[PDB]
Amino acid sequence: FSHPRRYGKGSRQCRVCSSHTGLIRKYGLNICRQCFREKANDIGFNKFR
Amino acid sequence: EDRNKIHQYLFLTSKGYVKTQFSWQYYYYTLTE
Amino acid sequence: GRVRTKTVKRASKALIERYYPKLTLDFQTNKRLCDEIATIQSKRLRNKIAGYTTHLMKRIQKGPVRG
């Protein structure tokens, strides 16, 4: 019913929105590039420069 | 049996005794008095 | 440019209005007195206020200034 999806863009999703595109796979985020832009301050990520 | 396993792993999603919050893809289920 | 805004100029004028028998025309002994007679919340703004007050009191000895 399902073939292996252990790698590639299909293996990972946004932990919030589950969108397979723009995923931030850095520092162990696993969050969308827009969902992180939304919930960035609440993680501890802020803008200074 | 196939339903008892989950009805005891807990401690039908519509009838009641299941209040479901989603909160990032995790289906938080809680029963009611 | 090097033009000073109102929150510099007006604070300097207010300092010179009541502290003429006070801080001289030298910036080093101007900012120090500013530190204790003004609630400046940043050293850069304090430096601006003290420099403009130094300029005001340096040109005060060449004729009275408006306002």
């Binding site: 931030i24 520092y27 992180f36 501890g44 990520f45 803008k47 | - | -």
Partner: protein, 100 residues
């Protein structure tokens, strides 16, 4: 007695110093010997992203940061002055790992 190394890490510099200064005086009030608090360089976790949730507009990039800070202090003391001292640093936001 046992020799230990306490490691203090946080994003909040104020409470990080609130523990790095509390620990020094809490060891001086018991008159111990300790290597000074060493401040490992801050890791600036800069992360670029696109402001646009789509692909329209001028190409404008926006970086975020969660600057992480960490220190380390080594000393030696008995077990009671180890546990009662590791129970002082519970400042919410600063994480403390005590190794032996």
């Amino acid at each position: 007695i046992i020799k230990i190394r306490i490691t203090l890490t946080s994003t909040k510099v104020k409470q990080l110093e609130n523990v790095s200064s509390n620990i020094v005086k809490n060891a001086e009030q018991h008159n111990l010997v300790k290597k000074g608090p060493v401040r490992l360089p801050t890791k600036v976790l800069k992360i670029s992203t696109r402001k646009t949730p789509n692909g329209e507009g001028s190409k404008t990039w926006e970086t975020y940061e969660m600057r992480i800070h960490k220190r380390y202090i080594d000393l030696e003391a008995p077990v009671q002055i180890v546990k009662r001292i590791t129970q002082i640093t519970i400042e919410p936001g600063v994480d403390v790992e005590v190794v032996v």
